[PDB]
Amino acid sequence: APSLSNLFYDPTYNPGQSTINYTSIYGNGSTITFDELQGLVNSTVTQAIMFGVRCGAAALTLIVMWMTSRSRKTPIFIINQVSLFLIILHSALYFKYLLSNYSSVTYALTGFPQFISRGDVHVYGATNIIQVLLVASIETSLVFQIKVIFTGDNFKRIGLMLTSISFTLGIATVTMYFVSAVKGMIVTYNDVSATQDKYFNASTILLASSINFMSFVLVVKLILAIRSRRFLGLKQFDSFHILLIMSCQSLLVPSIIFILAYSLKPNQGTDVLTTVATLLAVLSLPLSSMWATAANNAS
């Protein structure tokens, strides 16, 4: 401590509007303010909290489902039980990504391609392959729940066609995710500082569409379970409607978060919303799968 400056005695001095000087690819003359630097740092600090919550939740959901189940060997159980595992693997390679040189303040401010090695591109590839192997599990789970809802003593007209639109939506979502992934990889392998992003913002809309369709079909099943019982002389539900509708026996909360995630402009946390809604969908599949295979009028 040789000597303090005079600005130490200024009550109204504002650090954050001060100047930072650095050398970039455009020479030794780039400048930035401390608040744009802090805005770059606060978005990494905000995207690590979410994925740590995801890893925690999914690990403690996997164990609890292993310990609290009566009827194992069911396909729906196995698919629900590997989706929670691909969530944890996706979150692991993203923590690997978040501490690497592709997410550094060095690359961000100074766009030098010498800072990117081979090994940073292979974890990007691997993460883009686990993201599509997770969407495929979600879609196959939804198509088995739909295939178990209406098949049976119910009318075969509606039931046979709703599995068709759900198989169609699932295969289209998976194919579009695969296309997006394989082109992004080509682009990145050609140039490290290149971005290809027109196919990620329609894959999310089709995942959202398929979840909204599952919510519609479960609401349909509930209205027909309140309509069939009154025709006969059997007693109705006392306070089961509130549990089914409100708690996520039907996928209404993830569906609302999805419809507010892409309708709203990006400046209102649109990236914080899809990440919460994918977690809530994968966490709500065990609860949507108990109502789906339940006696409509036998009980």
Binding site: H90, S103, Q131, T188, T195, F200, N201, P266, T270
Partner: peptide
């Protein structure tokens, strides 16, 4: 349109 990815940011 609503989600923008960084040059090295993978899908989420």
């Amino acid at each position: 349109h609503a989600l923008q990815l960084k040059p090295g940011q993978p899908l989420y």
